[PDB]
A paper describes a structure:
Class I histone deacetylases (HDACs 1–3) are essential regulators of gene expression. The enzymes are recruited to chromatin as part of large multi-protein complexes that control the acetylation state of histones and other chromatin-associated factors. In the [name] complex, the large ELM2-SANT protein [name] (1045 aa), recruits [name] or 2. In conclusion, our structural and functional studies of the [name] complex reveal a striking molecular machine whose architecture appears to have evolved to facilitate processive chromatin deacetylation.
In all, 126,484 particles were included in the final ~4-Å map of the dimeric complex with C2 symmetry applied. The structure of the dimeric complex has an overall S shape. It reveals that the ELM2 domain from [name] does not mediate dimerisation. Instead, the [name] ELM2 domain interacts with the [name] dimerisation domain which mediates the dimeric assembly. The consequence of this is that the [name] catalytic subunits are arranged very differently, located much farther apart, with the [name] active sites on opposite ends of the dimer. This is a complete contrast with the NuRD complex in which MTA1 dimerisation results in the [name] active sites being positioned on the same face of the complex. The shorter helix in [name] mediates a tight interaction with a non-polar groove between the end of the long helices of the [name] dimer. One of the regions of [name] most similar to other ELM2-SANT domain co-repressor proteins is the ELM2-specific motif which binds in an extended conformation in a conserved groove on [name]. Density for the InsP6, but not the SAHA, was clearly visible in the map. The dimerisation domain of [name] is critical for the assembly of the complex since it interacts with the ELM2 domain of [name] and dictates the relative positioning of the HDACs in the dimer.
Author numbering:
A (entry chain C): 8 to 376
B (entry chain E): 8 to 325, 327 to 376
C (entry chain B), D (entry chain A): 62 to 130
E (entry chain D), F (entry chain F): 722 to 829, 833 to 879
The structure:
Amino acid sequence: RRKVCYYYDGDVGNYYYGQGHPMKPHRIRMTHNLLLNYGLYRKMEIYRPHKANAEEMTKYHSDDYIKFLRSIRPDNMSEYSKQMQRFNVGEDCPVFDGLFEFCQLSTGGSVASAVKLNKQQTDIAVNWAGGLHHAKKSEASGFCYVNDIVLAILELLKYHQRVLYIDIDIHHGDGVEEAFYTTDRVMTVSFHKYGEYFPGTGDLRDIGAGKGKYYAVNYPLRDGIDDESYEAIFKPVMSKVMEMFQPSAVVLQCGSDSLSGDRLGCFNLTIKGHAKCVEFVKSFNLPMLMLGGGGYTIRNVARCWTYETAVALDTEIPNELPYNDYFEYFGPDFKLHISPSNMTNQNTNEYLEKIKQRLFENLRMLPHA
Amino acid sequence: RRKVCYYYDGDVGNYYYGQGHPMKPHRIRMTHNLLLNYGLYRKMEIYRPHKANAEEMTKYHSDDYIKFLRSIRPDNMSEYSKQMQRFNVGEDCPVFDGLFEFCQLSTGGSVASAVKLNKQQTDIAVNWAGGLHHAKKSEASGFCYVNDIVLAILELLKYHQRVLYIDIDIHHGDGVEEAFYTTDRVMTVSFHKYGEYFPGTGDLRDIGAGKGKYYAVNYPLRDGIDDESYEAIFKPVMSKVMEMFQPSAVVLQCGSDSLSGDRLGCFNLTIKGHAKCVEFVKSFNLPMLMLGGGGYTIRNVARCWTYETAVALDTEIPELPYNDYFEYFGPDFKLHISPSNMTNQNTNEYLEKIKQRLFENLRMLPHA
Amino acid sequence: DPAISMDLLRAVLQPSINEEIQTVFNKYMKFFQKAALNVRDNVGEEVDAEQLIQEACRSCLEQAKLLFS
Amino acid sequence: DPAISMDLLRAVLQPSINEEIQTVFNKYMKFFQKAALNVRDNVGEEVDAEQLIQEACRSCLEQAKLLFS
Amino acid sequence: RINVGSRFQAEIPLMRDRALAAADPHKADLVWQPWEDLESSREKQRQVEDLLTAACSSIFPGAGTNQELALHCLHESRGDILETLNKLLLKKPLRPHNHPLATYHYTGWKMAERKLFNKGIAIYKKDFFLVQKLIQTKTVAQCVEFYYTYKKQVK
Amino acid sequence: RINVGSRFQAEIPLMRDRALAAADPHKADLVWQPWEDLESSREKQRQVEDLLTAACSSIFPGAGTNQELALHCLHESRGDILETLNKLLLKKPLRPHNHPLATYHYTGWKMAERKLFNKGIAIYKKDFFLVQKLIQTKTVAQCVEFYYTYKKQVK
Ligand SMILES: O=P(O)(O)O[C@H]1[C@H](OP(=O)(O)O)[C@@H](OP(=O)(O)O)[C@H](OP(=O)(O)O)[C@@H](OP(=O)(O)O)[C@H]1OP(=O)(O)O
Ligand SMILES: O=P(O)(O)O[C@H]1[C@H](OP(=O)(O)O)[C@@H](OP(=O)(O)O)[C@H](OP(=O)(O)O)[C@@H](OP(=O)(O)O)[C@H]1OP(=O)(O)O
Ligand SMILES: [K+]
Ligand SMILES: [K+]
Ligand SMILES: [K+]
Ligand SMILES: [K+]
Ligand SMILES: [Zn+2]
Ligand SMILES: [Zn+2]
């Protein structure tokens, strides 16, 4: 059967950003205990990621932006007031001790998982630590600092024929779109909230340029999407894509902020719905690369990723929880699977057929016979 | 401590003499089981005796008397009627199959025990199979056929300075007396019933001849002797004897027919009384040789010999374990027993008679 | 509980010790085999021979408890 | 009661097997000795180190009976 | 929106690169391996579960350590159970293993320093810099670890 | 009374005869030896008693054999217990031991020959010669052995 690889380090859980900030990377720690407590450790490889050096960082960002990260300290926060506003560092990207060292691990994690796929002896890998895509060349943005997803992809591009990227995250993956906007071998799909939402882009016309037309797709949506509503739009396109795009490598960003009970999100998803997606992708039997990303309800996040981790093994794991340290945090139900909120779907059936009726034959413009 | 040797064979228990005869050598078999069941096997050597040949038999008896034993059979009993009466073979010595083979073992037993004492590396030996003394050169007598006791002694005489013989048996040891009647190095003591009793001898004047005066002693008695009555006559003489005779080897014929409940005997003895004797003899620490002999109440016989066997080890033995012959041991099923109600018929003056007479008679002998 | 933690250690070491125990009885099983046959031969066929062997083996371990009483 | 013969067959053999059993547990006693102290380190001193060792060693024998049940 | 200068940095992709001397002898360090030749036969799977909760019992702590200390050690043998107890019984497994370094990586106390917590946090309540300043031995990383563990001690 | 001719036969006694090449390499055959270095310490004495009654139980008979068959065999080893069970488990201990001969010495049947007993003894009652005559395979020695053993069968 299919061999699987998983990555984790322990020092991530101690980092802290600042007062009232929603992102808190302690979430990754709780997930790691669940994989072991459920006995899934028998069926996967664990790896320790080492620190990422400035070498691979310079491959996308400037070497002077990096030297600023070494010279900053929270006690000397005042001297660099002009530069701090210049690079968007502030309320959405506060400064704290060990800020760089936090990103060294998330960068090292996905870049490491890149290679064992380049080794071309296995299909599946996972890293819930990464999934940071909002970063740019000379500025942080949207709580992210480094666009490590691209840095991991560059190792894949050297070896792999065509790489399909996906972004289920309720936030739009604008950063990744910027780097593959005029190249055909990379397709960039992204399902996201649109209309008064960060980063405020992702319209239908965001299509490409030069030869890049019909190679960087979007499919925006509004709040209240149901698990069953998701079904009528994900499956039909993908089946149309595989003979069309002819992929050789998938990169599935499992942005779990799209689940119910979110501080930020306003979707109507559960664990079964988002996990229903991956069973269809696994059906195609191709090299995958799962990643995490956003997520600010720490309680339901680990419930989702632990399930998706088992599904890559096509193994069942029953409903319920064993003795562990973080047991009480798992709601008053103490059950893995959950229920949604009471929100209905606000998207009309005609609103579904819009891009569907329009875009499927638009793709038929491409060459194939 | 003192090492001990014991002898036994198993084929003796199958022999049978004839109708209504009192001697039945199955008695030896029951004794053998008791030594093992009591755990005494840990403390002694067992030996198998082999068949005794005519060689050592010819050393005392005639070689033609022996050839008659080979030619006799119960089916051809009639042809030898003249010879049978001539050698006293008859009502008191019936004929039966395996008659010679029975004596081969009893002869082989004591003659074998003779040697390990001649080896001069141990003191004590036992053979309850022997103890036949009434036999003569050319005739059986008193239920016995071979005087194996003498045949065993001849090996001892070659090696041992002086041999003291004793005969507690209610029958008198006339056969042994006949062979040591004019020699000083062998003393022959014998306590026995006297007055209308087989063999009808054993008076006071039976003393010796030539130099043999005061070297073949007797001390006859009458019925009803008690265990305590025995005490006043056995101990005092022996203490007087040891410095006088200077023995080097004892031969204690433990004739157990002297016990109560006997078909023949009329004594008033128990197991403790006859066993009280040997503790005094063991006190002297000298080479011993215990033998059996008479006995026709098979029930009490094994109770006596098993006790005396333990006393040579100066060991205590307490009642009976599980065994095959358990039910034969009376309704009490207890080792020790009680006597009959008979009193002593011997007067205190009757005790002092030989005592007042004989102790200074012995002082005639040379010592200073 | 203190005694429970020892019992969780017990489950770890049971198969290793149980293997050596099975090696021990195999040396002495030969005495048990003929013993069960002859008893059934003398008493009668009705007695199940193999059950008797199992009964004695469990009894042998009961007395070994005295080492650590 | 044919099993009486078997109980006496056992008494002949029990003192011999108890030599080999003592040899076995001596191998694993190194696991128990320092471990029991560490239990008495995290908990108070009131518990006797020797008693728990005697408790589990008897407990191990009971489970081995399944092979010969 | 679409900044041409911040697009990419000359990725130079080939998409075949057959045997380009693949990287990661160091970026990823294997610390756990399956074994299913003897173990996973629905006969010995439970044998490891009884071991697992055995660690979460009356045995030594290193810093507060229920089971995670033991799982990294089983990979050391790759097929055994009892060999771990040899080194687990040892005085420390933390000290004699310095090259692997995982012994310190798992989880990442005095009454005096604990006294300064209720004196430290219960006054200023949102400082997070005087917290490490007045408790000098501990870092803000360590000082945060007790906050998540303290949540059970109320109930 | 005192027959001079039947007194003695030239005993020729010396009473010293120091080392006259002592006899009995054959008249007496040792079949049992103490052992008190390890056995008799009030610790292993009972060990032999449990063996003893073990023979008197559900084990093979040779001719009807409770315990005596086993004691002569322990002397064969002189210090052991288990070595006897090796040869006791053997098909016969009677046959393969022919030089020692003790196997036949311990104790010394068909329904047909048993039928002739009640037909033999119950008529003539005091013959003891027709007893062996009409039961030809058995001797008068063997025919007497059943008489003592039969006494229990009434009660
Ligand atoms: O008061 P509750 O209803 O139990 O909710 C609180 C609260 O969340 P909300 O403010 O969204 O209600 C906390 O937020 P702050 O009070 O810190 O602003 C949050 O803390 P974080 O936002 O820092 O996660 C905490 O979560 P936790 O318990 O994980 O610290 C969470 O409590 P619950 O998790 O029990 O809902
Ligand atoms: O009838 P019991 O009370 O059982 O006693 C008899 C009886 O002995 P008593 O006559 O002294 O009572 C026999 O004697 P007789 O009938 O032959 O005169 C005797 O036979 P022996 O005298 O020939 O020995 C026989 O003994 P055994 O059974 O050994 O033949 C013995 O029976 P117990 O031995 O059972 O007492
Ligand atoms: K998206
Ligand atoms: K593109
Ligand atoms: K006499
Ligand atoms: K004389
Ligand atoms: Zn997101
Ligand atoms: Zn007599």
